[PDB]
Amino acid sequence: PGDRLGVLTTTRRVVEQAQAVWIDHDAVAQIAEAFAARQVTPPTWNRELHWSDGREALANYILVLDAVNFCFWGEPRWRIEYAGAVYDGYWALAASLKRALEQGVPLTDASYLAEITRDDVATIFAGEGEIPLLDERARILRETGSVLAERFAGRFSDAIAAAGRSAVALVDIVTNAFPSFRDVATYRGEQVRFYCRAQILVSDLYGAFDGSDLGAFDDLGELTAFADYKVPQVLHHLGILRYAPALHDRLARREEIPAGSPEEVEIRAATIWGVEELRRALASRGHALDAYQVDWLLWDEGQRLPAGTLPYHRTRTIFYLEH
Ligand SMILES: Nc1nc2c(c(CN[C@H]3C=C[C@H](O)[C@@H]3O)cn2[C@@H]2O[C@H](CO)[C@@H](O)[C@H]2O)c(=O)[nH]1
């Protein structure tokens, strides 16, 4: 199997044992048949709302972007004005960085990031309501800058160069060096490995560089889905993920689910395998996509679900460590 990060191997043990979540392989077959019938294809890379520049500064942009790419929910809803449009969620994040960099804030400079304060980021992300975990995003941007400065001469380009066109080796280099990116958990006393933000970071570089230079990777097939909260919401909507009663009610009542709890780990593990079972079934029906592509394609559908879909699971992302 390969699986040199062990995301598939460890998460497969969760899916086999899982009590609150299961895959409906009949629904997988139906959806594969339909997505393959209209030979569907993923979004390219939405380079309207992503900042653009030279090799060194752009590679740093991607690392910063995915360093604070998490948890956008809470009331009142966090919205952002940018260039005549109002944005929320992940698109509010990317617009907020484009705006800032365009107003001349050096978010690609290690020295600036290492020193960046609560006040700075409060303003970078200012708008309707406030971005969740404002302080934690400040700490992570400081942590990101210091590591860039010390270990990679302020250039994420150096870290990427070291990977040698291996997506899998880059994720390893990232999690080894940047504590914020260490996305693992336990389930019934076993380590489960996810590497959500670390893995998406690799996919974003492939997008931003059109699979050339710093975005060149020979093993993108090895990436898994990026297990957060939108893709499972879509897989449930498509009938591929089923939730048992107590968990279905929590999600419907918009009750927060403690991070690293069995129910939370079950949803993320099932999201990885939900996407993988869909990739295999699409491949069987003559439509070969990589796992990250099926994830990109599903996250895409998540932007336009009908109102009255089961709400996404709400987890206060934790990393309150590195002391
Ligand atoms: N799993 C997953 N997550 C995605 C995305 C995206 C956007 N991906 C773009 C990349 C290529 C296409 O243009 C897609 O629109 C943001 N995010 C955000 O990244 C985090 C990890 O899921 C969450 O905060 C999401 O809101 C995705 O495709 N898959």
UniProtKB/Swiss-Prot annotation:
GO molecular function list: hydrolase activity
Taxon lineage: Bacteria, Pseudomonadati, Thermomicrobiota, Thermomicrobia, Sphaerobacterales
Alphabetical UniProt keywords: Hydrolase
Function: Catalyzes the hydrolysis of queuosine 5'-phosphate, releasing the nucleobase queuine (q). Is likely required for salvage of queuine from exogenous queuosine (Q) that is imported and then converted to queuosine 5'-phosphate intracellularly. In vitro, can also catalyze the release of the q base directly from Q as substrate; however, Q may not be the biologically relevant substrate. Shows a very low activity on queuosine 3',5'-diphosphate, and cannot release q from queuosine 3'-phosphate and from the 5'-nucleotides AMP, UMP, CMP or GMP, indicating specificity for the queuine base.
Alphabetized Pfam families for the sequence: Q_salvage
PANTHER family given in the database record: QUEUOSINE 5'-PHOSPHATE N-GLYCOSYLASE_HYDROLASE (PTHR21314:SF0), QUEUOSINE 5'-PHOSPHATE N-GLYCOSYLASE_HYDROLASE-RELATED (PTHR21314)
Homology family: Belongs to the QNG1 protein family.
Organism: Sphaerobacter thermophilus (strain ATCC 49802 / DSM 20745 / KCCM 41009 / NCIMB 13125 / S 6022)
Record's signal peptide: none
Keyword Transcription regulation: no
List of catalytic residues: D228
Binding-site positions, queuosine 5'-phosphate: N69, Y90, C196, F226, D228, D295, W299, Q303
Domain of life assignment: Bacteria
Oligomeric and partner information: Monomer.
GO biological process, one term: tRNA-guanine transglycosylation
Catalytic reactions on record: queuosine 5'-phosphate + H2O = queuine + D-ribose 5-phosphate
Name of this protein: Queuosine 5'-phosphate N-glycosylase/hydrolase
EC class (word): hydrolase
EC number: 3.2.2.-
